[PDB]
Amino acid sequence: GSEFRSMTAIEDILQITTDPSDTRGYSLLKSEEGVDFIDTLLLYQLTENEKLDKPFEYLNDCFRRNQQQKRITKNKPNAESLHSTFQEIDRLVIGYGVVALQIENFCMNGAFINYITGIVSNVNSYTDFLSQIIQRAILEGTALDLLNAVFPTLLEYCNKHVSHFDLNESVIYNNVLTIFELFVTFKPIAEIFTKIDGFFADYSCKPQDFERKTILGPILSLSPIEAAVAIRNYGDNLLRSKQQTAMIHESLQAEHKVVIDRLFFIVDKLVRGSLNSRTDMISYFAHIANKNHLRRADHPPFKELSSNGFMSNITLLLVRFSQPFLDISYKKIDKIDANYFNNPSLFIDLSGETRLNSDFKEADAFYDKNRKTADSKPNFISDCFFLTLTYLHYGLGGTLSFEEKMGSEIKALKEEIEKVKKIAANHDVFARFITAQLSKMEKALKTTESLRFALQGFFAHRSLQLEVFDFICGASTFLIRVVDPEHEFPFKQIKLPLIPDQIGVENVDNADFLRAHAPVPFKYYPEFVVEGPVNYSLYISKYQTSPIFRNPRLGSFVEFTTMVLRCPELVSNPHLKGKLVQLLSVGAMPLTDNSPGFMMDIFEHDELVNKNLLYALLDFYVIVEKTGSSSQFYDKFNSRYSISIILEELYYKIPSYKNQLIWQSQNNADFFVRFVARMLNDLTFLLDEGLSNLAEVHNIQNELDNEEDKELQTRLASASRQAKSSCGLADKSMKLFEIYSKDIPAAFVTPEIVYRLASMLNYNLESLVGPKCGELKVKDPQSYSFNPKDLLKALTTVYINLSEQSEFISAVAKDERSFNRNLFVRAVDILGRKTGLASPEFIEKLLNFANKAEEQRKADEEEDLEYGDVPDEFLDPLMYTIMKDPVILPASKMNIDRSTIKAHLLSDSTDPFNRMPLKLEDVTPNEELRQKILCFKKQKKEE
Ligand SMILES: [K+]
């Protein structure tokens, strides 16, 4: 007999008795008065006992005492006699704990919110009981009811019971994450999680509320780039040292790392739950994306879009889900469906999305032609990969464009508060109005300056950024496989060009042709597939801890870039390719020590790169000419500036390319001559538009003596940006002519180049040597890439590098328009003032050339008025005989004797002058010219 040890246990654990004379402060009931009495004491303590304002905390404390009273007893004899009770306590306590989180108004005090509030504040002390409650709910098949009572409620706690649910509230967000982990770890729960009320957004939910009104909202927003977290961590003292600033960057990164790890774990469990769950997971993220495209606008409506912290976290998550399939072995590389866009999109809203090389019509058409294939096919692995590309662009892309602009925002803001800080407000009302205004501005300035530090801390976070770029590289490999006609890459090299090089790009907008011959599925992929990677790559390149620098997978993206820059059919958009070519220029620039750019090794040893890089650059340098957009008609000059930086470096550091160039000019002169023609044409005006602009910059600073002060900015600034771009391209163009004319002099004196070259050179020489450059007054000439001395030295060097080609000295001499010996005399004068020129031997060579030039001119003058009586227009171009039946060639517009072309068309049916196919039928007679000759032969009958 010892059942007294029971009722005494039932009371010390449930903390309740019936007698008023109890020593310890236990609740007391005045109803009736062992084991078969527990359900009664409990039911009472939860529904009729007013002193228990915190019911769930009670049931939890009871359960915990019973577990303590359990481990304490067994280690003794009387043990066996209690087991019966502990058992029934557990069975009912967890049973009501389940009910407390399923039926709303079941207890006499509080509701769901009050209970989970208690749980969040001290999650650890609730863990065990919660575990039991969950198991109980699934064994009974009522887990969803459990979840609809805890997570939708938790959403209310994060939005209403906390000022801000962000990284600041350390204790609170960690506990919330824990109650999330504890739950999703049970698969029976994970496979049902997305069915919870509020997991999806209401149709009328605004994008900025996705992170507030959706179940995964709050925790997915946990990031160091939330304004409140930035102000708190950096706005604190924006004047601290880079050393101290680096410490908080470290703290925030360490903390952010953990956050995405736990977030990944939670989403991973929901994706592994079932096929239904991961599918809803794709629907969930697709919606977040489809409604945030404006995050990529020029002036984004921030208050109507999701935050950078949210979108960026999701981009990171997606990236890890995709990482496995893009590992360096690419063994699972085919799990990703290349025909993903062959049918109407099921998740990612592609309307309005520009394709690589195609329009809507063709896309829809592609959809009809493919309805023959499975209509349904929501393949998760592919969805996730392409969703990652979507977030890379709209999520991260909008976050990086956001901080890329803060510099100008801060500068302009500082000028606004300084302008307002001058106002003298006499009236008290006006004074408050002005101070209020200064208050709003400085309040925004602090947010911006703090957020900028926060954003830089995030992008300098190599660990994370590395994951992002390695995905770009894996994405690259994947895209090259789509393009490769045998879809074998990287297991079998890819063959470039795809379609043979159009010997004569001299066709009517290849647009239609190229598009028609664009790669099968690739031509339909949305443009953000390439723009995302390149916007990102160009952007993080400014950080010292860049993912791109010294990364072993860089080659993949370089290979992809080269492929695009090589086959004009792949991506039509010239603007997009200019970006790529700009990334390459970044990877080609030397350093302080003057060692190879970080991409040079790849350019030299990557097979797919060194086999096409040079030709791609030379070809793209030319194609950007067929561009004409709104504020993008000046990017073809930036593309050329960039292509030029690369050309120069490749030529100095990699003999392999120096040889590819040389070879090119001899084995494919047509292509090579086509490239220097464009460099030549542009060079006839570059220095001129540089001088015109610097002229406008000096006018404006003059008008500033005290028109509309504002417009004189978007103006003056704009003139400087044209001056720097013009003088800069000119400089790189001369260098290239100089750099090449030294090794392949012959290539530049071919008839299609020599006369135009001599003219262009002489024109610039006149400019440099005279009043056009001499009269120009400027601020920091260098700030605009304007070095008239460097230019004059490189120009003069070109002459010297070509001063042994009779054709060139003849061309320079025959240049009526600009040639004049005194120009070289002046040049020799300028170069002989400041120490800068391989002279006086150099000056020796130039002056020599100038002399041969003047001699060649005097001879030509003598030859003309002494040995040429018959006016040149009457002489046949090829026989030099006086024409009897002059006719006009349709293509060349040249006049030639009928007898001559006939003789030519016999073994060659083409225009002797430009090889344009010609037939004798389309030759138009020139009667007016023939009569002038008949008239000449007539008067010539003197004797
Ligand atoms: K938040």
Tell me the sheet residues that pair with 875. 882
- Which are the contacts of 438, defined by CB distance < 8 A and separation ≥ 6? 417, 420, 421
Q: Gap positions in the chain, given as the residue before each gap (C–N > 2.5 A)?
A: 33, 706
Q: Distance between CA 846 and CA 864 in Å, rounded?
A: 27
Our separate counts of H helices and E strands in the chain read: 41, 5
Resolution stated for this PDB structure, in Å: 2.6
DSSP string, 696-765: HHHHHHHHTT---TTHHHHHHHHHHHHHHHHHHHHHHHHHHHHHHHTT-GGGGSSTTTHHHHHHHHHHHH
Q: How far is the CA of 173 from the centre of ligand 1 (A)?
A: 10
Q: How far is the CA of 162 from the centre of ligand 1 (A)?
A: 10
Helix (H, G, I), strand (E, B) or coil at 839: coil
Q: Distance between CA 22 and CA 190 in Å, rounded?
A: 47
Helix axes 428-459, 397-404, angle to 10 degrees: 130
Q: Please state, in angstroms and as integers, the Cα–Cα distance from residue 763 to each residue in 441, 469, 675, following that order.
A: 53, 47, 20
Range of the domain at 941: 869-943
Residue ending a domain, choose from 868, 891, 921: 868
- Preceding omega of 224 cis (within 30 degrees of 0): no
Q: How far is the CA of 164 from the centre of ligand 1 (A)?
A: 6
Longest dimension (CA), the chain: 163
- Preceding omega of 490 cis (within 30 degrees of 0): yes
Sheet holding 924-925, edge to edge: 895-897, 886-888, 924-925
* Whether the Cβ atoms of residue 239 and residue 276 lie closer than 8 Å to each other: no
Q: How far is the CA of 256 from the centre of ligand 1 (A)?
A: 14
Residue 618 tokens, joined: 């030379």
Q: How far is the CA of 255 from the centre of ligand 1 (A)?
A: 16
**Does residue 454 share a domain with residue 424?**
yes
- Which are the contacts of 213, defined by CB distance < 8 A and separation ≥ 6? 155, 198, 201, 202, 205
Q: Distance between CA 565 and CA 487 in Å, rounded?
A: 20
**Does residue 680 share a domain with residue 724?**
yes
- Which are the contacts of 692, defined by CB distance < 8 A and separation ≥ 6? none
Residue 53 tokens, joined: 């304002």
Experimental method: X-ray
**Does residue 875 share a domain with residue 740?**
no
Q: How far is the CA of 211 from the centre of ligand 1 (A)?
A: 7
Long-range contacts of 294-298 (CB under 8 A, 24+ apart): 295/394, 295/395, 295/397, 295/398, 296/393, 296/394, 296/397, 296/398, 296/401
Q: Distance between CA 209 and CA 790 in Å, rounded?
A: 58
- Which are the contacts of 930, defined by CB distance < 8 A and separation ≥ 6? 883, 884, 885, 886
Q: How far is the CA of 306 from the centre of ligand 1 (A)?
A: 11
Q: How far is the CA of 218 from the centre of ligand 1 (A)?
A: 5
- Preceding omega of 840 cis (within 30 degrees of 0): yes
Give me the number of domains the chain comprises: 2
**Residue 631 DSSP symbol:** S
Q: How far is the CA of 305 from the centre of ligand 1 (A)?
A: 14
Q: How far is the CA of 120 from the centre of ligand 1 (A)?
A: 16
Q: Distance between CA 212 and CA 115 in Å, rounded?
A: 21
For residue 484, is it left (φ>0), alpha (ψ between -120 and 50) or beta?
beta
Token pair 């736990």 is found at 262
**Does residue 895 share a domain with residue 860?**
no
Q: How far is the CA of 289 from the centre of ligand 1 (A)?
A: 18
Burial class of residue 784 (count of CB atoms within 10 Å of its CB; 0-12, 13-18, 19+): buried
Q: How far is the CA of 569 from the centre of ligand 1 (A)?
A: 45
> CA 449, 450, 456: angle at the middle one, nearest 5?
90
> CA 282, 287, 292: angle at the middle one, nearest 5?
130
Q: Distance between CA 929 and CA 920 in Å, rounded?
A: 19
Q: How far is the CA of 220 from the centre of ligand 1 (A)?
A: 8
Residue ending a domain, choose from 843, 868, 893: 868
CATH of the domain at 878: 3.30.40.10
**Residue 419 DSSP symbol:** H
Q: How far is the CA of 159 from the centre of ligand 1 (A)?
A: 8
Q: How far is the CA of 150 from the centre of ligand 1 (A)?
A: 19
DSSP string, 871-889: -GGGB-TTT-SBPSSEEE-
Q: How far is the CA of 262 from the centre of ligand 1 (A)?
A: 16
* Whether the Cβ atoms of residue 434 and residue 420 lie closer than 8 Å to each other: yes
Q: How far is the CA of 221 from the centre of ligand 1 (A)?
A: 5
- Which are the contacts of 231, defined by CB distance < 8 A and separation ≥ 6? 446, 447, 450
Q: How far is the CA of 169 from the centre of ligand 1 (A)?
A: 10
* Whether the Cβ atoms of residue 241 and residue 471 lie closer than 8 Å to each other: no
Q: How far is the CA of 201 from the centre of ligand 1 (A)?
A: 16
Q: How far is the CA of 160 from the centre of ligand 1 (A)?
A: 12
* Whether the Cβ atoms of residue 378 and residue 282 lie closer than 8 Å to each other: yes
Q: Distance between CA 473 and CA 466 in Å, rounded?
A: 11
Q: Distance between CA 546 and CA 539 in Å, rounded?
A: 10
Q: Please state, in angstroms and as integers, the Cα–Cα distance from residue 792 to each residue in 798, 824, 905, following that order.
A: 10, 11, 47
**Does residue 762 share a domain with residue 909?**
no
Q: How far is the CA of 402 from the centre of ligand 1 (A)?
A: 19
Selection from 342, 320, 197, 336 nearest residue 263 by Cα: 320
Neighbours of 50 (CB within 10 A): 7
> CA 377, 380, 383: angle at the middle one, nearest 5?
90
Q: Distance between CA 430 and CA 424 in Å, rounded?
A: 9
Q: How far is the CA of 8 from the centre of ligand 1 (A)?
A: 49
Helix axes 711-741, 636-653, angle to 10 degrees: 30
**Does residue 644 share a domain with residue 740?**
yes
Question: For residue 806, how many C-alpha atoms fall within 13 Å in the half-sphere facing its CB?
Answer: 0
Helix axes 428-459, 242-273, angle to 10 degrees: 70
Residue ending a domain, choose from 868, 900, 924: 868
* Whether the Cβ atoms of residue 757 and residue 748 lie closer than 8 Å to each other: yes
Helix axes 806-813, 754-769, angle to 10 degrees: 60
Q: How far is the CA of 213 from the centre of ligand 1 (A)?
A: 11
Q: How far is the CA of 129 from the centre of ligand 1 (A)?
A: 29
> Which alpha helices (H) appear in 74-169, and where do they start and end?
80-100, 112-121, 127-139, 143-160
**Does residue 38 share a domain with residue 152?**
yes
- Which are the contacts of 290, defined by CB distance < 8 A and separation ≥ 6? 348, 349
**Does residue 895 share a domain with residue 839?**
no
Q: How far is the CA of 310 from the centre of ligand 1 (A)?
A: 8
Tally of residues, the chain? 943
Q: Distance between CA 143 and CA 167 in Å, rounded?
A: 30
Q: How far is the CA of 325 from the centre of ligand 1 (A)?
A: 32
> Which alpha helices (H) appear in 140-241, and where do they start and end?
143-160, 170-184, 187-190, 210-213, 217-220, 227-230
Q: How far is the CA of 344 from the centre of ligand 1 (A)?
A: 35
Helix (H, G, I), strand (E, B) or coil at 79: coil
Query: Which amino acid type is present at position 234?
Result: Y
Q: How far is the CA of 174 from the centre of ligand 1 (A)?
A: 13
**Residue 501 DSSP symbol:** P
* Whether the Cβ atoms of residue 735 and residue 648 lie closer than 8 Å to each other: yes
**Does residue 895 share a domain with residue 863?**
no
Q: How far is the CA of 209 from the centre of ligand 1 (A)?
A: 10
Q: How far is the CA of 313 from the centre of ligand 1 (A)?
A: 12
Q: How far is the CA of 165 from the centre of ligand 1 (A)?
A: 5
Q: How far is the CA of 395 from the centre of ligand 1 (A)?
A: 16
* Whether the Cβ atoms of residue 58 and residue 89 lie closer than 8 Å to each other: no
Neighbours of 875 (CB within 10 A): 17
Q: How far is the CA of 332 from the centre of ligand 1 (A)?
A: 37
Burial class of residue 416 (count of CB atoms within 10 Å of its CB; 0-12, 13-18, 19+): middle
**Does residue 793 share a domain with residue 877?**
no
Q: How far is the CA of 178 from the centre of ligand 1 (A)?
A: 17
Token pair 């995964």 is found at 216
Query: Which amino acid type is present at position 222?
Result: L
Q: How far is the CA of 307 from the centre of ligand 1 (A)?
A: 9
**Residue 923 DSSP symbol:** P
Selection from 521, 520, 509, 623 nearest residue 576 by Cα: 623
* Whether the Cβ atoms of residue 492 and residue 312 lie closer than 8 Å to each other: no
**Does residue 824 share a domain with residue 883?**
no
Q: Distance between CA 231 and CA 404 in Å, rounded?
A: 19
Q: How far is the CA of 4 from the centre of ligand 1 (A)?
A: 55
Q: How far is the CA of 484 from the centre of ligand 1 (A)?
A: 45
Q: Distance between CA 591 and CA 640 in Å, rounded?
A: 21
- Which are the contacts of 690, defined by CB distance < 8 A and separation ≥ 6? 722, 723, 726, 727, 730, 784, 786
Selection from 37, 47, 31, 32 nearest residue 14 by Cα: 37
**Does residue 935 share a domain with residue 864?**
no
Q: How far is the CA of 278 from the centre of ligand 1 (A)?
A: 24
Q: How far is the CA of 268 from the centre of ligand 1 (A)?
A: 21
Neighbours of 243 (CB within 10 A): 7
Q: How far is the CA of 411 from the centre of ligand 1 (A)?
A: 29
Q: How far is the CA of 418 from the centre of ligand 1 (A)?
A: 34
